Amino acid sequence: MFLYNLTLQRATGISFAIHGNFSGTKQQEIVVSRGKILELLRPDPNTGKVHTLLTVEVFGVIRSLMAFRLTGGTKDYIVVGSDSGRIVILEYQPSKNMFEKIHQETFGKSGCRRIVPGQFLAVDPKGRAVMISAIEKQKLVYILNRDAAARLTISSPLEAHKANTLVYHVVGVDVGFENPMFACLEMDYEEADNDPTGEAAANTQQTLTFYELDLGLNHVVRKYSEPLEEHGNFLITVPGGSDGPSGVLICSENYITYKNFGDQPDIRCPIPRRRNDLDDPERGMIFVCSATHKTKSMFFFLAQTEQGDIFKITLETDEDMVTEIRLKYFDTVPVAAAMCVLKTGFLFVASEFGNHYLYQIAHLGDDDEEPEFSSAMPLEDTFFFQPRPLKNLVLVDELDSLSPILFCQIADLANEDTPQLYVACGRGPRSSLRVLRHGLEVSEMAVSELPGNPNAVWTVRRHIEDEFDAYIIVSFVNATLVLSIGETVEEVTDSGFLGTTPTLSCSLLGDDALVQVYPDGIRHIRADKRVNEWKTPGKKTIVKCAVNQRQVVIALTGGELVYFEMDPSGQLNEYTERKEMSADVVCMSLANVPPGEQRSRFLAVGLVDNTVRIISLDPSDCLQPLSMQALPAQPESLCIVEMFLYLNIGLQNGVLLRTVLDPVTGDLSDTRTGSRPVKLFRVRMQGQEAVLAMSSRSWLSYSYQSRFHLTPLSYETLEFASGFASEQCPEGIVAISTNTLRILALEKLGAVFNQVAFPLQYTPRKFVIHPESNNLIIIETDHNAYTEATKAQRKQQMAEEMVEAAGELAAEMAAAFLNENLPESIFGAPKAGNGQWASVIRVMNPIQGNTLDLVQLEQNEAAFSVAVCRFSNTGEDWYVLVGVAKDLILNPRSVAGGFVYTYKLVNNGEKLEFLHKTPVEEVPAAIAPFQGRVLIGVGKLLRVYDLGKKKLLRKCENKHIANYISGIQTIGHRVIVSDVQESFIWVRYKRNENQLIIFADDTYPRWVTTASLLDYDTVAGADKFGNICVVRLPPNTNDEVDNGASQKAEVIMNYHVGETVLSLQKTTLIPGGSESLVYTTLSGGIGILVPFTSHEDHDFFQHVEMHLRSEHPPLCGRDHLSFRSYYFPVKNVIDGDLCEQFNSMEPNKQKNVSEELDRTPPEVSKKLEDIRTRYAF
Amino acid sequence: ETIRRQLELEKKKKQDLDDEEKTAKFIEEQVRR
Amino acid sequence: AKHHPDLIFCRKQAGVAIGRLCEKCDGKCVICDSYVRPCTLVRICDECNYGSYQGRCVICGGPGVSDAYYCKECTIQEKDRDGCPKIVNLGSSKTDLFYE
RNA sequence: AAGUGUAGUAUCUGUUCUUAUCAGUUUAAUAUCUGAU
RNA sequence: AUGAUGUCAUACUUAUCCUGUCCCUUUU
């Protein structure tokens, strides 16, 4: 099973973040670091839109990201800390749009080792040095220095090995060209390592160690050591020198402490809390993340709390010491994983789950009625916080980035043929059941019904200096109308067309001269009030036409063509030749005049006899054929465009043919756009020219990072198309549908898939598809939380407590706490509990967004699995079995009891009813059908029960399970049981004797999180450590039975997914393609593994991978063999992600690869595109 | 000796290209449906 | 080494220096002790090259000519990412050879 | 009727425990070794 | 009927190895 990796959607989650002028210009860039891919974004200052400027797969585990800016520079470097021991300092290359490795230095071994630096990376403020520290027993300090050629030279590192010192975090001290210092929150472990009494384990306080890198001594030294009151969580360097004072503000559990260097004292400030918050009192508060807005006048910090309430810290500074820490409630934000305060008043807040956020900094935190809690303000007691909506920030945009995809189901849940991917992702209030569909969402700016039979649409501008559309021509069946585009769309007649009949073409001939062509003839309307007409000689009817920037071709019946040249003085010169084609022209194509040339070189013409021919348009070969090309179908249209150009042609069938642009026709590519005519028009989007489609689906093909890519537009079919542009419409499509007009616009240029979610309340666990009702039942379960009834009880208890205060008793404020329930999604979910949990069953309309049924469990309950199936003893009553556990816990000391509520799910699959409630033994985590009975997993027991009157009668039991039933896949006769600590095991269930017997086991273990039945003996399974394997049983498996077990199986597939996969149901994606295994990721990525159906293809892919391993290696310094064989070795898996770099590879690398492979670089491109076209969308 | 496999390799490549062309034609006929 | 098991490698921290090997030991792997398939370059220690210690041979210990590299067998086995492989010791080899 | 040196390994030839017990070291345990009857 | 013991011979492996120097001791 030689599979090929294919990444359909990259990871949208943000793990690390930096903000700075990395592009080397005045614009400010945002460098985001996902799990295994880096991205550079340059959002619109005015438009407020975040565009993915660059995206590159790091081919490694990016663990830390810290910026660098040398003294006297205007372009910031990028320090990339990876799982490998190679410290990398890269630099942007906008001239080439590629991340250039400026420096790379090896430090140690591979793997995220405890003695392996990479867990912490810091850059000093002066830009003179960088530091890399591991979890313990490692600290290196690299020196950066400017060269004579301004080359950042990495000097040798300084050794700072500190044994038995666990580093909690690292930060840079403030030094104005003096001896720089680096701070770290160290903890000693050697003392408590020799304390059998357990006393020295306590009284072990973390200490801020400030190590100074003496430039003269050229060695690090422990400069200062300062204990703290309690353990910390994060540090923030207060900028020193001319701007602000030196110091490091350390956050800890319910505290923030500013203890600078020298003789400055420690200033404390507790973390506020929500007034009358329903959270647990025992739960503290820690600084989740923090950013600093450094200004020449002052400096403030924005810090997000565990509850997402972004507070504004201000450092009240004395003449030479810290005066106090001034805190203020800035706003309420989501659970924040990273925050970057960029210039132009923008705040990029990336959450650990859900879509990103980019707000506009309007209020500076002052000049409001909110109070400022200061360190000097005493309390004894914490300052209660009065939360409110966004008062100082405005949400400009939201970066979707569908993150934690708990489950996935790729099927035609809708009535359409294009299957939809129902993927559930979120975290409690951030729930979202995104029905992803492979397409492009066109924002319908406006639509207007057109009478009669509209036939064609075109849009001509006013002049060369016109930055917007001016005229829109609509050719009806028996007439043609014109409209003036000036924010006042209405009738227009003073344009100069006089098209009372349908026109064959209409465009802008000159800088402002219009050229129209109707069956009567041509009409050149210059900028002045003049219209030079030219009738069609004879009875030949105008078949087609094609305009250019400085040329115009017309094609009448019988293959009689005519050329017209735009003179320099605006005169239209008629061609001095009557070029006759082989037959009548079904369509023609002509390119635009480039900047250098005055006209086009070649011009295309397709005959009705299924054959195309390009003829030289130049004067040396005017009306001279140049190159022929075969057409197996009636040509429907033709089109040529740049991006290095190509020639496209739509046939009469639902398919089209594309070839390379040259003096002759080169390669050939084809894809069914189709069950409709292949019409084509020109468009300009993302600063690039492209072809807009007109078929059953509007396949919009454009360049996507040096690679053509096309998806259909999620809208109705378009009959005619043209470009539209204005102040309100930057770049969109004005289209004519069947008796209607549509001015649409699609900004989302990120070729992937569109989706719209149906949110929920609690976090999901699994999904079950209602076959008849076509509904979806989702198990919403989230631990460490309280139930809605639990929230009501807690609110009532708090109300009674507040009323018992008897505070003038007369305070009618409890009604505000009882009635004003803050938004759980906006103002955060005030949930808590070490063992408290909550579950909710919900059935909703997929095509709709309504919850057709909802059901709530108990407060001490917690769901783990759900399914829907019919019972053998019962009739067509498809019962919904949902298992949940009471009194559970993340710590290893919980079980209490298990319950399997027996939902009825009746009334046309829209009425649940938990009649039976059979109690379980341990913690249930699985339920499936088998021979009509319910196979459930009670801990280390497999119980095949039968749906009885009171409870599911346990008709059979098996006690061969090792640890716990994590997954149960029901085969036709056997069953694949995947344990939590053990690998898969195939067990045969003899129905005649009613006995389950383990048929075999696996050799290597794997923490299976999901599973899929590949075949009658093949089973695929993910790994909690980030692995995906496929075990195939041998022919000699003794299915009849009566180191650990007897029969063993082999590992047929092994490949590192890079991100934790949790769903795999590979089937059939793009209809007409080969079935494949679609795999999800916890970081928001959906890939597709497909097999190599040819040994020659396998050898070609292997040679390509072996060449790319040495030609275009990663930037993080990790090896492909190591990046793929982290947890377990690679086994017959071709990493197509590394193969995709051939399109982005340099020209010399492309030539070297073509030489090593004995083929052409376009040959490799076609071979790579063939797999993507055959096995994917 | 390698030239023999090279000729056979080119023949197999042409056969696979013809098979891929037939498969593409069939997929296009299916998509037309 | 396979030829000299009584040798002590430096195992010092890596620097920014590129080393060279003696002409008599040209091409010999620093770690693998092989003669084919090199993958990565050899990095010298900071203290391993300072004046008179600069320009010496890694394995041979003599004056270097060509730039050495780590063996691919040592690179794939995660062996090339170790400390400074400078032969600090000199014993059980070329000791009595001067007497002859 | 020609090989030099640096480290390590095995197969060949010659010798030895009918010592009854106790305690200890050591051994996985024996063995060996160390003191007394 | 395996073994321990160790002068004295024997085969083997490390792609073992022949111009290596006082370029560094200049203390009274």
UniProtKB/Swiss-Prot annotation, chain A:
Localization, UniProt: Nucleus
UniProt cross-references to InterPro entries, sorted A to Z: Beta-prop_RSE1/DDB1/CPSF1_1st, Cleavage/polyA-sp_fac_asu_C, RSE1/DDB1/CFT1/CPSF1, WD40/YVTN_repeat-like_dom_sf, WD40_repeat_dom_sf
Positions where Phosphoserine occurs in the chain: 156
Organism: Homo sapiens
Site positions per UniProt: Interaction with SF3B1: 963, 1131
Stretch list, region Interaction with SF3B1 and SF3B5: 193-231, 765-783
Pfam families according to UniProt: Beta-prop_RSE1_1st, Beta-prop_RSE1_2nd, CPSF_A
Modification sites for Phosphothreonine: 1160
Species lineage: Eukaryota, Metazoa, Chordata, Craniata, Vertebrata
Chief location: nucleus
Subunit structure: Component of the 17S U2 SnRNP complex, a ribonucleoprotein complex that contains small nuclear RNA (snRNA) U2 and a number of specific proteins. Part of the SF3B subcomplex of the 17S U2 SnRNP complex. SF3B associates with the splicing subcomplex SF3A and a 12S RNA unit to form the U2 small nuclear ribonucleoproteins complex (U2 snRNP). Within the SF3B subcomplex, interacts directly with SF3B1 (via HEAT domain), SF3B5 and PHF5A. Identified in the spliceosome A complex; remains associated with the spliceosome throughout the splicing process. Component of the spliceosome B complex.
Domain comment, as recorded: The core of the protein consists of three beta-propeller domains.
Positions of the record's site feature: Interaction with SF3B5: 284, 306, 352, 427, 891
Name recorded for this polypeptide: Splicing factor 3B subunit 3
Region (Interaction with PHF5A, SF3B1 and SF3B5): 105-119, 145-168
TM stretches of this protein: none
Family per record: Belongs to the RSE1 family.
Gene name of this polypeptide: SF3B3
Swiss-Prot record, chain B:
Tissue distribution: Ubiquitously expressed in all tissues examined, with highest levels in skeletal muscle, heart and testis. Differentially expressed in non-tumorigenic and tumorigenic cell lines. Highly expressed in proliferating epithelial keratinocyte cells in vitro (at protein level).
Coiled coil: 1-33
Protein induction: By UVC irradiation in quiescent primary fibroblasts. By mitomycin C in human melanoma MeWO cells.
Compartmental location: Nucleus; Cytoplasm
UniProt similarity note: Belongs to the KIN17 family.
Assembly, per entry: Associated with DNA polymerase alpha, RFC1 and cyclin A, in multiprotein DNA replication complexes. Also associates with replication origins at the G1/S phase boundary and throughout the S phase in vivo. (Microbial infection) Interacts with SV40 large T antigen.
Entry text on domains: The C-terminal domain (268-393) is organized into 2 subdomains that bear structural similarities to SH3-like domains. Both subdomains adopt a similar 5-stranded beta-barrel-like fold and are connected to each other by a short linker of 5 residues. The 5 beta-sheets are packed at approximately right angles against each other. A highly conserved groove formed at the interface between the 2 subdomains, comprised of Lys residues 302 and 391 and other positively charged residues, may possibly be the site of RNA-binding.
Something else known: Recognized by antibodies directed against the RecA protein.
Name by which UniProt lists this protein: DNA/RNA-binding protein KIN17
The organism of origin for this protein: Homo sapiens (Human)
Full protein segment contained here: 147 to 179 of 393
Curated annotation (Swiss-Prot), chain C:
Residues the record lists as binding Zn(2+) 1: 10, 45, 48, 84
Region (Interaction with SF3B3), start-end ranges: 78-81
Residues recorded with modification N6-acetyllysine: 2
Gene field: PHF5A
Full protein name: PHD finger-like domain-containing protein 5A
Substitution effect: residue 35 to E/S/A: Alters the structure of the presumed branchpoint (BP) adenosine binding pocket within the splicing factor SF3B complex which may lead to decreased binding affinity and thus affect pre-mRNA splicing
Subunit structure: Component of the 17S U2 SnRNP complex, a ribonucleoprotein complex that contains small nuclear RNA (snRNA) U2 and a number of specific proteins. Part of the SF3B subcomplex of the 17S U2 SnRNP complex. SF3B associates with the splicing subcomplex SF3A and a 12S RNA unit to form the U2 small nuclear ribonucleoproteins complex (U2 snRNP). Within the SF3B complex interacts directly with SF3B1 and SF3B3. Component of the minor spliceosome, which splices U12-type introns. Within this complex, interacts with CRIPT. Interacts (via N-terminus) with U2AF1 and SRSF5; acts to bridge the two.
One of the GO BP terms on file: positive regulation of DNA-templated transcription
Record-marked site positions (Interaction with SF3B3): 16
Domain of life: Eukaryota
Site positions (Interaction with RNA): 99
Subcellular location(s) of the protein: Nucleus; Nucleus speckle
Region feature Interaction with SF3B1 and SF3B3, mapped onto this chain: 34-50
Residues recorded with modification N-acetylalanine: 1
UniProt keywords, alphabetically: Acetylation, Activator, DNA-binding, Metal-binding, mRNA processing, mRNA splicing, Nucleus, Phosphoprotein, RNA-binding, Spliceosome, Transcription, Transcription regulation, Zinc
GO MF annotations in UniProt: DNA binding; RNA binding; zinc ion binding
Keyword Heme: no
Binding site for Zn(2+) 3: 29, 32, 71, 74
Similarity section: Belongs to the PHF5 family.
Pfam families: PHF5
Residues modified to Phosphoserine: 93
Function: Component of the 17S U2 SnRNP complex of the spliceosome, a large ribonucleoprotein complex that removes introns from transcribed pre-mRNAs. The 17S U2 SnRNP complex (1) directly participates in early spliceosome assembly and (2) mediates recognition of the intron branch site during pre-mRNA splicing by promoting the selection of the pre-mRNA branch-site adenosine, the nucleophile for the first step of splicing.
List of residues binding Zn(2+) 2: 22, 25, 57, 60
